[PDB]
Amino acid sequence: SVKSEYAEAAAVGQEAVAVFNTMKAAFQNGDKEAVAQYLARLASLYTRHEELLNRILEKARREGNKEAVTLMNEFTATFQTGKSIFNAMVAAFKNGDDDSFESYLQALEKVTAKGETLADQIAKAL
Ligand SMILES: Oc1ccc(-n2ccnc2)cc1
Ligand SMILES: Oc1ccc(-n2ccnc2)cc1
């Protein structure tokens, strides 16, 4: 069901939260080798999450579930804000700009926390 597909997508999102927090600890500790691996792992999770979200939005559209489509359009837009911040974070790591890395890291945490009420609202709407 589209609802069970959203729960699967929500779990992938929570996997990225977990890996992101370990990555933040590694960054603070200066373990740049770990950071690089976590960033690769996070890119794969976000690419997977985005694909599950697009499939869910398209299905809600085919089902005519107007409220769920509205919420998912808003939620996908916020996801892309997070993705842009992430990709900038990755560039700051490549460049050795720890000041920018810290900045982008905090921004991504705030974008994500803000988007969580909507994330829950979608589960209920599908
Ligand atoms: O697919 C995702 C979802 C949330 C993510 N995140 C939570 C906190 N900072 C990033 C990252 C990737
Ligand atoms: O709340 C978030 C967190 C991370 C996100 N992301 C990282 C890479 N692509 C999406 C998107 C939305």
- Please report, as a single letter, which amino acid is at residue 19: V
The CB of 11 under 6 Å from ligand 1? The reply is no
Contacts of 95 (CB under 8 A, 6+ apart): none
As a whole number of angstroms, the distance between CA 46 and CA 14 comes to: 11
The CB of 108 under 6 Å from ligand 1? The reply is yes
- Alpha carbon of 16 to ligand 1 centroid (Å): 5
Experimental technique = X-ray
The CB of 83 under 6 Å from ligand 2? The reply is yes
Q: Which of 66, 46, 52 is nearest to 126 (CA)?
A: 66
- Domains: count for the chain: 1
- In this structure, are residues 49 and 13 in contact, taking their beta carbons and an 8 Å threshold? yes
- In this structure, are residues 16 and 46 in contact, taking their beta carbons and an 8 Å threshold? yes
Q: Which of 88, 97, 102, 86 is nearest to 49 (CA)?
A: 86
- Alpha carbon of 78 to ligand 2 centroid (Å): 8
As a whole number of angstroms, the distance between CA 77 and CA 97 comes to: 27
- Alpha carbon of 49 to ligand 1 centroid (Å): 9
Angle made by CA atoms 23, 81, 67, in degrees to the nearest 5 = 120
The CB of 13 under 6 Å from ligand 2? The reply is no
- In this structure, are residues 123 and 3 in contact, taking their beta carbons and an 8 Å threshold? yes
- Please report, as a single letter, which amino acid is at residue 35: V
As a whole number of angstroms, the distance between CA 102 and CA 68 comes to: 34
For 92, the domain range is 1-126
